[PDB]
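User: Predict structure, ligand (3R)-2,3-dihydro-1-benzofuran-3-amine.
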Amino acid sequence: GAMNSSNYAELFNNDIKLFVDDTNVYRVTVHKTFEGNVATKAINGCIFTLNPKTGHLFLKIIHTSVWAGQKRLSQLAKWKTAEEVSALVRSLPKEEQPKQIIVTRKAMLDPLEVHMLDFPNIAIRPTELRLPFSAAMSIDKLSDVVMKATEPQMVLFNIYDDWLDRISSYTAFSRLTLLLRALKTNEESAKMILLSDPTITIKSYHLWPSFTDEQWITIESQMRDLILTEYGRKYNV
Amino acid sequence: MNTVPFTSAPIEVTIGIDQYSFNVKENQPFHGIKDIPIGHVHVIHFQHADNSSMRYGYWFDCRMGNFYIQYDPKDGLYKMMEERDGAKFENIVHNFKERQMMVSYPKIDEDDTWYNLTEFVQMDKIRKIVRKDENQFSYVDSSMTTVQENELSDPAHSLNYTVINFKSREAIRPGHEMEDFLDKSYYLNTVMLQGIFKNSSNYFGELQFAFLNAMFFGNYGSSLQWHAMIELICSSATVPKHMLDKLDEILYYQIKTLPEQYSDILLNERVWNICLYSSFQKNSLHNTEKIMENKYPELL
Ligand SMILES: N[C@H]1COc2ccccc21
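Assistant: Predicted complex:
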């Protein structure tokens, strides 16, 4: 059924699973027309498809041309997401295909279920977790590849960098969600924390800085503080 | 006009014949039902006074044979049987009529209710939904499950309604996933009408039969089938105009006939609100929407 705090360790067992987040597939800026009406202009988007155990991110870039001449785009975006996830599953060797796909928003269930009828053994599940995957576009290198795409493209990342050499996938996921929650609540401050110290850099082949274990503890503490600070600024506490 | 005689009434029972119901007391001198209109299927149904568990009954057509009811004290129910000896049967019926031991199918002359509820129901199609080929009549009861219910247990005692499942490969063409899920016209017109039912009359016959089994037996799987066949039409953007007009008439008389006090269990709020107010056909069911709104405005 649904995924929540009671079965959280299931994410890191040895059954292949993917989270699918569609919140950055259909992106727009809203603006005034010369006539004083309002219009939208789409920008490039992306499907965020993540293996939480391995960190393997399948970033399908959604180029604005896919919306050309189409109606009901927010509805179409869910079906396009499901189309692309289904295509990805079919492209993977049988032994790499997921046993479960967890969608971060319930409106993806029926589109994905319909597109995966050929895979009756793959469980399509919602989750009660509020996951911050919308903030994926606050990761500079992911945002960059999306905005530069001139055509549909799939780009593969490891969203954990090399962290699994030193920590478990439970801890890596906890770090990721804390970083993304911080970037979602106050992007400017979160990025300031991540780059304040010029001596710690992001390797060319990585997404996040090359923090030592002790430095990650400090960073993690600063991100918690930020989320609490913002919680206080928001609610006046 | 035809007759279904009863050997006797050894147990107290509420008897129904189509939309009419009457009570018979234990060992009351009762020997059946006369003046049954020829030209329609009929259903004779039972609810024991001492155990309202299991409404059960028999669908039949008097043009196909001479049928009677006889209580079986071993199996504990009123059973329909066929009498092959026609002169024997005629003589039995004539004696019971002379002794005035039979109630009369109370059809008002103006009243087209039963025709309107059974317009497309045909015994031969009933006998393919209810498989028991040695008899010309068909037994249904409260508890019988459908072929689809079993998939999700005895197959001989099943209601073999046509399986409708909106999230199935049958309903969804590869590469038209969104199209076919949001507009079921392919599934209605090509898969079901052209493919399975052959014409809208057979589709409507099964829809009407499902409703009647839901209403008269409280058969839950029949209620599911009735709602599924309505939703499949309402969720199709492209439906022949004559089918929409006929569906409106069919539903109108079903809603008109439904006991007010059973509306809570026989009507699916989600399906009806979708069909009347959100679906492609939301504007095509004028008669049904008007009676629904005046009779069950709470459900909406
Ligand atoms: N209770 C009335 C209403 O319908 C019938 C049918 C047969 C005998 C009696 C009645």
